[PDB]
Amino acid sequence: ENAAPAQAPVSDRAWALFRALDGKGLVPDGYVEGWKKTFEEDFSPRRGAELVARAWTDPEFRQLLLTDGTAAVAQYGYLGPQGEYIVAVEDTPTLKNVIVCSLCACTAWPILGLPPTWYKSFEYRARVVREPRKVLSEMGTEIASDIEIRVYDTTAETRYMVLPQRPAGTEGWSQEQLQEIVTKDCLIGVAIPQVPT
Amino acid sequence: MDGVHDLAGVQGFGKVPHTVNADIGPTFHAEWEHLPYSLMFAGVAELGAFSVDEVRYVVERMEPRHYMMTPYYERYVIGVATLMVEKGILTQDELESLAGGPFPLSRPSESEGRPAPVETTTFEVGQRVRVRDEYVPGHIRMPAYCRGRVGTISHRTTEKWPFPDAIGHGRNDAGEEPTYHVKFAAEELFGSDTDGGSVVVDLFEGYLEPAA
Ligand SMILES: [Fe+3]
Secondary structure, three states: OOOOOOOOOHHHHHHHHHHHHHOOOOOOOOHHHHHHHHHHHHOOHHHHHHHHHHHHHOHHHHHHHHHOHHHHHHHHOOOEOOEOOEEEEEOEOOEEEEEEOOOOOOOOHHHHOOOOOOOOOHHHHHHOOOOHHHHHHHHOOOOOOOOEEEEEEOOOOOEEEEEOOOOOOOOOOOHHHHHHHOOHHHHHOOOOOOOOO | OOOOOOOOOOOOOOOOOOOOOOOOOOOOOOOOOOHHHHHHHHHHHHOOOOOHHHHHHHHHOOOHHHHHOOOHHHHHHHHHHHHHHHOOOOOHHHHHHHHOOOOOOOOOOOOOOOOOOOOOOOOOOOOEEEEOOOOOOOOOOOOHHHOOOEEEEEEEOOOOEOOHHHHOOOOOOOOOEOEEEEEEEHHHHHOOOOOOOEEEEEEEHHHEEEOO
16 A cells, blocks of 8 residues: 555654663763764864865865865864765866765765755755756756766765865955855855855 | 665656755754764764664665655664664664654665675776676665766775675675775766766775776
8 A cells, every 4th residue: 555654753763762772871971962062063064164265275285185185174173973084076167066975865074064954855866966957957056068067976985075166256365254155055066156246 | 785775867856955055954953863873873883783884774674665755864763773673782662662652663684795805906097997787685885877887987095994785784704995986977877868977986896897
């Protein structure tokens, strides 16, 4: 009949799992609370934005970020769980990069933040590998015909960030000013940094 | 495993539920949502009960209709719970007692996995490679769209990791391999039915062979 299995409320199941483990001494004091804090406060696309703004204003760092992403990220102390081997991929006037995990949700957590619901969606996982131009267009990003789109499928341990092109009209901006226009979606590759009118 | 989780290239889905830079809300949209990852880390790092690869595989082992109607964080809760039961740490009875109702788990594995391949090749940037035309019923980190396809090496990793097809089953023979960023032309993967340029897949050495 293709029907769903009967299930207790998900909150009840999730807390049951916690209580079953915690009741056996298997979860250290403050353990899940500590991870929650890390997930909410430390893992952040602000970190990736900082890296981009530095790369944009420092040719030496840009070169390091593109050749040894891990080393570059380590300078800021931003290595972490699901972000131990980093590769940054460079957008150019003829190339737009986009990241996905078609098999699940793999994402460079420490520098992009945990993946959002849309990135984990079956829609994004199925479609972006095959029709990235249409997907980006629907999301609000038009990529011209003479730009190649390259989709990176995060299938192993490499964790990716996009280094977008620096937009015109940002000449001489400070790192703080540049950081502001580099969003989570810019780092994933579905958005291009926007300069206010 | 040729499961429903191998979604790349599937046709018929609608719009991605996002427009660029739209508000995505808080990291967690419910008070339980930090639990799957934090309990996975307890299992991996504190208990040493399973690997992250085992978590990916147990989620792949969800009954297909169940997988398709379950949100991501819930799949993870189900996966971690299943692993805790399979490894003998918890019982399903105590989970359902604490939950106050049904707590169906992923299906048992139908494969014992496979070891890291004995015979592999160290590839160089610029080399042409073909993805081995192999079918693996257990865990594998090769999406089906690239099976048997030819591409070029863009990167060989400077680190090595256990072979997923082994460690995803908790085997002792996962060894270690580097992975390769293999660039495929869109037309190699989807013929005329793609609007893309290239796709780069991060493939373990043991999934590859020289082209020709
Ligand atoms: Fe993933």
